[PDB]
């Protein structure tokens, strides 16, 4: 699918949310560092079977007015470009 | 094994209870607001009237008794 680089808003810069930092010191990973530490098995399950190949698109409508990023979420599209209507 | 047999006779043992009448759960709620926001304010006045109508009663029923 295509999507415009610019959307006018009356209530604007598009970034296509792609986060995933995966911090250390996250409470669920500190637990994990503690919980899967040492002996025992791989002490937690892990998604092995296949997946939904197509991924849903969060889209962050960051207003050019300084602050307060919005987030819209599109549908599941394989190819996503911000070509903006050539 | 889908059967649907004996089911219509199970639904008619304890009976297929009739529906509740309209004076049951007639909550005009989730309906169209500009109606119920007016059918609200008119209930407030009609309650100030219901309270007021009992005020003269007792006071008429006192002196006139």
């Amino acid at each position: 699918v295509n999507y415009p680089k610019k959307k006018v808003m009356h209530c604007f810069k598009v970034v296509q949310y792609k986060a995933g930092k995966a911090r250390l010191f996250a409470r669920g990973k500190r637990r994990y560092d503690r919980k899967q530490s040492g002996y025992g098995g791989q002490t937690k399950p892990v998604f092995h079977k296949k997946a939904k190949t197509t991924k849903k698109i969060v889209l962050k409508l960051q207003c050019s007015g300084c602050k307060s990023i919005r987030q819209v979420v599109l549908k599941r599209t394989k190819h996503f470009e911000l070509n903006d209507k050539k | 094994n889908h059967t649907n047999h004996n089911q219509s006779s199970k639904n008619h043992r304890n009976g297929i209870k009739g529906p509740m009448p309209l004076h049951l759960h007639n909550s005009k709620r989730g309906s169209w607001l500009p109606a119920l926001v007016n059918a609200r304010r008119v209930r407030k006045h009609n309650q100030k009237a219901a309270l007021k109508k009992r005020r003269e009663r007792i006071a008429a029923f006192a002196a006139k008794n």
Binding site: - | I16, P19, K28, S31
Partner: protein, 149 residues
């Protein structure tokens, strides 16, 4: 149980009738509904935006809600051992003002107006006559019957 969508097994049900297609009436747009009257929820196609589920098609019931362009209708649904007063939300074109009471709307309108005429009224104009009794009937053509082959 491969398909059970919101519009399943409904070819002939939502299909318009023969030689009567297209836009809805101007009567059905100029109807007048209140909270309380009865309506036949006859889902017509050719509007395709606001049709109820199949089940609520031959069904008639109170209007508990009249939004700007959606009539809210309660409908009795015999689920398994009890009936639910379902609360459907459809548009006006899927709705008729249900006759289902003209049977006594028009009865007690003239029935009382003559019971009053029979009780007090002004006078008692004689009404419909008796139906089933005897009679020395005079025939007008004799006949018999044996066979025709």
């Amino acid at each position: 149980v491969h398909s059970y969508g919101y519009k399943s097994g409904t070819r002939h049900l939502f299909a318009k009738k023969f030689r009567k297609h297209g836009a809805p009436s101007v009567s059905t747009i100029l109807t007048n509904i209140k909270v309380g009257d009865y309506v036949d929820v006859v889902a017509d196609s050719a509007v395709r935006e606001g049709m109820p589920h199949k089940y609520y098609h031959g069904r008639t019931g109170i209007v508990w809600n009249v939004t700007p362009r959606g009539v809210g209708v309660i409908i009795n649904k015999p689920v398994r051992t009890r009936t639910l007063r379902k609360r459907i939300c459809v548009r006006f074109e899927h709705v008729r003002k249900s006759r289902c009471q003209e049977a006594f709307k028009a009865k007690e309108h003239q029935f009382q107006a003559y019971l009053a005429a029979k009780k007090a009224g002004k006078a008692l104009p004689p009404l419909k006559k008796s139906s089933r009794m005897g009679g020395i009937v005079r025939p007008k053509n004799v006949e018999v019957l044996a066979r025709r082959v």
